[PDB]
Each structure stands twice: as structure tokens, then as C-alpha cells.
């Protein structure tokens, strides 16, 4: 990691706007760590399709992620490009299909199913690179621990966490993709419909599946990481909204959390923790702050470059079941 900012950019505590990156003007909010001397671990929380960044940071039911600063983490929270730097935008002009080859508009988190997405098969996209520039700039003002830079998020922010970990595994120390997509494809990269992607994982639940969330093909080896993937149970599903207001199922997080866990668990320098809860498709609801504390401290216990054999999982809060390895309670096993 290199600490540097766009020339003349003056980072500040709180809201930062007009940060220049790849021709766009971006914004992000900084909450410096409390009760910490020396470099602090970093948490980069990302909202989803409808909650605002302010909701994700300050509303309890949305995770109140800014409270992690009171827990000793410097929180650096990006605003979605579609929100035009307004951290209060919720779903307006954000909650819907993407443009310019992107699948979904909240974040540049997956290539589209049509040929316009081809270019994103091997270019991380402007959000993955923005986050790296953002953290590198904040680190010129606040002391950040370069071995403990973590990002994470819910829904589309979870999908973005997955993309960022696959393209920038030599920067981040790990992440927390909560109910994010994988956009499972065939091995040859062919995009699959929601239905066909869902069936592919059910038919081969322990295999590594390619997906539009990441590089095509997925990398043979990624940098050292700890990744904690969270599934919200039977109701962890998303219904899209048509132009006419009607709703329809368009994402099921059982196959995407399984697929992510298969890929990350197979990686030799990655500790993968699979966590299950029953809250559905939203920020973890049972003992929310206890979960945020447990999850970030778990990630922080595996600083970048740590030996996976040295990792020791502690019990999560009531309402969660977690273990090291791929998910196992989502599909019936072969031997069964």
C-alpha cells in the first residue's frame, strides 16, 4: 500500500466530495477510529440498492456501520456513483439495471448479461479502483493499518465486495459480502438467466462456478485474505420491480453465497468463514451491533499475510451459525 491523494485533495473527517477518479467526481464519509493509538484497522461498508449510505451508516436496522468507529476502526464509506454524491439518496436512480455494460446500477459490481458487458470480464471497473484510491488518500491523514483494510456490504454492496476481493486481492486484507450475488455463468463464461444460474448451482453445489461478479475466468490464485460470506436463510431473496411497479423474483442468495464460499474456501491463502442467519435479505437483524463487532474483530484477527492454519474462529452472537470452509447447510450433500 502507498498513501497518496489526488493532487491538492484535502481529506477531512466526515463527508468528502468531488474526489476525482477515472473522470467521475466521487464522495465518501470518514469516521476516524476511537480509543486507538497507532495505525487503525479499516472498515469500508457499502449500502445496497435502496438504503442510503447515511442509512447504512447510522440507522440501526440498516447496520449503523459508523458505530464501528467507536469500536476502534476507521470507517471509510463510499457513496454510490448513481447517487451523484448525495449520501441520503435511497433507491432514486440507483435501484435498477445498470448501463454501459454493468449489470446493476448501485455499484459497478458485475458485467451485464449481454455483449456490452464483455469489456468488464477483465477490468475491475471504476468502483473497485475508486475504493483503493479512497483508502490510499485517507491514509495520508489518518494512520491506517495496511494489513487490516476490510470492505463489506449488503445486497449490491455484497456483490461489490465479492468483485473487489477478486480483482484487488493484493490490496484488501479481507471482506464481508452479506447476501451478495455471484451471477453464476457456465464454465465458458456464457451468462445464465436467474433460473438457469440457480439450477446450475443446485446441480453441482460443491463445485467452483464462474460468475459475472468477477474476472472471466476467475483467478487461479488470489492474494491472502479472510472472507466471511453471510446468507440470511430461506427468505434471503430479492424481488425486482418492473417499470409498471409489479414485483418478480430476480435473485436468490443461497446459490450465490454457496458459490462464493466454494471459490474462496478452495483458495490456499484465503480463510473463508461461512455464516448463516435467518433474517432474510437485509443487514443482519438479530443482535446487529454484536454481529458487526464479532464479524470485524474476526476479520481483524487474520491480518494480511497471516497463516490460515493459525486462524481461530470464536463463537458468533446468538442468531448465527458459522464455520471455516464452504457452506454446507444449503444443499444436500453427495454422500446423502
Curated annotation (Swiss-Prot):
State whether it acts alone or in a complex, and with which partners, per the record: Monomer.
Any coiled-coil ranges, and where?
none
InterPro entries hit by this protein: AB_hydrolase_fold (IPR029058), Plant_Biomass_Hydrol_Est (IPR050955)
Say which enzyme class the record assigns. hydrolase
Q: What is its EC number?
A: 3.7.1.7
Species per Swiss-Prot/TrEMBL record: Pseudomonas sp
Name used for this protein in its record: Oxidized polyvinyl alcohol hydrolase
Q: Which GO terms describe its molecular function?
A: beta-diketone hydrolase activity
| Disulfide linkage | none
Q: Which domain of life is it from?
A: Bacteria
* Reactions catalysed according to its record: nonane-4,6-dione + H2O = pentan-2-one + butanoate + H(+)
Write the record's keywords in alphabetical order, separated by commas.
Answer: Hydrolase, Signal
Task: Spell out the family assignment given in the record's similarity comment.
Answer: Belongs to the peptidase S9A family.
The free-text function statement in the UniProt record for this protein reads:
Catalyzes the hydrolysis of 4,6-nonanedione, a beta-diketone compound. Also mediates hydrolysis of oxidized polyvinyl alcohol (PVA) in the second step in the degradation of polyvinyl alcohol. Not active toward the monoketone structure.
Indicate the residues that form the catalytic site: 155 (charge relay system), 261 (charge relay system)
